[PDB]
Amino acid sequence: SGFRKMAFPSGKVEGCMVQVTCGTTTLNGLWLDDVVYCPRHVICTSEDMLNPNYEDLLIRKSNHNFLVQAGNVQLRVIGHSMQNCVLKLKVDTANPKTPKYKFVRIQPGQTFSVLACYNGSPSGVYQCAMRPNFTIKGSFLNGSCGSVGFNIDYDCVSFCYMHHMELPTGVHAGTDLEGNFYGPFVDRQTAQAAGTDTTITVNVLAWLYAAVINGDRWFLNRFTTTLNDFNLVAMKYNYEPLTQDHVDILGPLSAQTGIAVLDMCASLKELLQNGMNGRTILGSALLEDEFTPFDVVRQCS
Amino acid sequence: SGFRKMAFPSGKVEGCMVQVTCGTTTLNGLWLDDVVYCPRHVICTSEDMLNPNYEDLLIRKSNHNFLVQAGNVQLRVIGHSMQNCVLKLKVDTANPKTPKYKFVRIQPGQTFSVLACYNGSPSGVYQCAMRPNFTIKGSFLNGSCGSVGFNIDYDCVSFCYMHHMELPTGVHAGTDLEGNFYGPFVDRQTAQAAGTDTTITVNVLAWLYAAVINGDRWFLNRFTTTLNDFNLVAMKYNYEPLTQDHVDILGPLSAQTGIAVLDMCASLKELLQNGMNGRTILGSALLEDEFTPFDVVRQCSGVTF
Ligand SMILES: COC(=O)[C@H](N)Cc1ccc(F)cc1
Ligand SMILES: [Cl-]
Ligand SMILES: [Cl-]
């Protein structure tokens, strides 16, 4: 037993991380088969930060303006193309460490591991969720751009996030590995701010099911609720609406614990009303929302 | 910016994990050079585990009684011996993935990364502290035994923990890699409990420094204090005593924020007495004690391996 913020083993991603330099700018790239992926803003200079014309700045570059370093080795860039906000540098060596991989665009509430990297070297691994406002609450210093987020269900590495920038509230914005931003963000230093964030209701419920699996029952009650009455209460605490999809997804955790999804919804309503009364659930005095139903089943069974 | 519970990258350690089977028991082994390390309790049956004679059980075994699998490849065991509570299975082949490594024994309050594994397959990685009561608050299911805990210092992996057992309260006990238990525990099915735990004072103060560095500053105040006065408050709240050595180790963070440790201790004195008055610090309602000063300095300065 026990319950922890648990990241995927980072080794398969570690073997893909390289340093990309262009002009005076250095960040991380992701080396898969014969392609290095990195944020396109690497090609930006000081004045190219507000209104960069990426197609104009790129056509001015030769392959040899791009310095790609895998550990001590320099890779030879033989080709450059842009897809959305991601630069793809073709190189003359396929990465011998390339794992089984795919690119997946995730939805708000999904979790993933982040391999924070500086100068193409890994610093740490941790868990994040895509917030409802399409940001992530990461840990990222200058030079971390090109760090990626991933899942590793069943030997295949699913790349779902590449880090581009920090917003003024200290949260992080980035793209899928096809270069499309999560949320309404753009790779320009024009004033941008995340929408008001909300709590990922379905994840909070999954975590209370985790608490019950680990032998805690103090917060349960003899009440139930309609889905509609639950949503009318929850949204007064800035909780995401719970959908019939969210109810379906919790069916397996409902079956394992024998507590109906809407019974657990009643427990959450009361928790929101009462707080914890000096108690903790799985070592938190707050309601945790960065574990999905899938995460709880992976870790508890 | 941002501040997260952050494990070391686990790649160097993933390439060392194998499956070890003896009779009906499978668990994990650590393959370094030409030796596989695992818990000695792999040699026991249910019946053995109530009062095991490890000497006696071990001599009865032979090399071919130990099935060691690295991926889809059997390793040949050419020797077996025991060091304290760890079994050492000498194999015919050195791990070509062996990293630069030491075996290190850590102090309570020190943190490390756990690579939870099942059937020799790495499953997840998380940060832990060795609690003052010598337990770790892990996340382990059946077949997790032989999972290991480590730090990285430059390119050298320091292995500090091997998983042996779960105590009745859901917390975890194991050994260093020389097979010495952390805490007053033994590898037998008998009655064992975690001592009452205490809070790691120097780590809480490190995490307050991380909060200030990330612009969470509400708990700061005009007051200062002394070790003696603070330590009477600490003792009252089941907090480890703060030594002069801890103040020196916080020196860097105290500098970089212009809060002196006894200035911060005055902040912490007030939180224990008053609570958080409905607030959070770095998205926690609790006083987090599983980040060391080194953890905070490294994460906030982007140190790389
Ligand atoms: C060329 O180096 C850079 O990355 C720029 N100096 C900074 C930068 C530009 C755009 C953006 F969306 C994020 C960051
Ligand atoms: Cl998704
Ligand atoms: Cl997040």
Q: How far is the CA of A289 from the centre of ligand 3 (A)?
A: 9
Q: A interface mutation test: which of B126, B271, B291 has the most A CBs within 10 A?
A: B126
**Domains of chain B in sequence order:** 1-14+100-197 (2.40.10.10), 15-99 (2.40.10.10), 198-301 (1.10.1840.10)
Angle at A217 between CA A215 and CA A220, to 5 degrees: 150
CA distance B275 to chain A (A): 10
Among chain A residues, the shortest Cα distance to B303 is held by: A123
Catalogue the active-site residues of A. 41, 145
Q: Give, to the nearest 10 degrees, the angle between helix B201-213 and helix B293-301.
A: 20
Q: For residue B41, report the phi and psi dihedrals to the nearest 5 degrees.
A: -65, -5
Four-point Cα dihedral B130, B135, B139, B141, nearest 10:
140
Chain B, residues 140-169, CB within 8 A of chain A, namely 140-141, 166
Q: For residue B202, report the phi and psi dihedrals to the nearest 5 degrees.
A: -65, -30
Instruction: Enter the resolution in angstroms.
Output: 2.0
Beta strands in B66-191 (DSSP E): 67-70, 73-75, 77-83, 86-91, 101-103, 111-118, 121-129, 148-153, 156-166, 172-175
Q: Contacts of residue B298 in chain A, CB cutoff 8 Å?
A: 123
> Which strand ranges, in their side-by-side order, compose the sheet holding B86-91?
B73-75, B67-70, B17-22, B25-32, B35-39, B86-91, B77-83
Smallest Cβ–Cβ distance between A2 and the set B2, B140, B285 belongs to B140
Per the structure block, which two tokens stand in for B102? Answer: 């030491």
Report the nearest atom of ligand 1 relative to the CA of A43: 1
The answer to whether B35 and B91 are in contact (CB under 8 A) is: yes
Smallest Cβ–Cβ distance between A11 and the set B15, B141, B302 belongs to B15
Q: CB within 6 Å of ligand 1 — which residues?
A: A 25, 41-42, 44, 49, 164-165, 187-189
Q: Contacts of residue A123 in chain B, CB cutoff 8 Å?
A: 6, 9, 298-299, 302-305
What CA–CA distances, in Å, run from B94 to A27, B12, B20, B33, B97?
Answer: 36, 15, 16, 4, 9
Q: How far is the CA of B170 from the centre of ligand 3 (A)?
A: 27
Task: Tell me if A170 and B215 make a contact (CB, 8 A cut-off).
Answer: yes
Per the structure block, which two tokens stand in for B242? Answer: 């703060």
Per the structure block, which two tokens stand in for A224? Answer: 């139930």
How many other CB atoms are found less than 10 A from the CB of residue B96? 6
According to DSSP, residue A49 is labeled: G
A&B contacts, CB < 8 Å: 139
Closest listed residue to residue A220, CA positions, set A263, A256, A257: A263
| Method used to determine the 3D structure | X-ray
Smallest Cβ–Cβ distance between B138 and the set A2, A143, A280 belongs to A2
Distance CA B219, CA B19 (A): 49
Chain B, residues 104-143, CB within 8 A of chain A, namely 115-116, 122-126, 137-141
Distance CA A141, CA A116 (A): 9
Distance CA A218, CA B42 (A): 37
Type and span of the H or E element at A298: helix A293-300
How many other CB atoms are found less than 10 A from the CB of residue B266? 20
Per the structure block, which two tokens stand in for A68? Answer: 């790609």
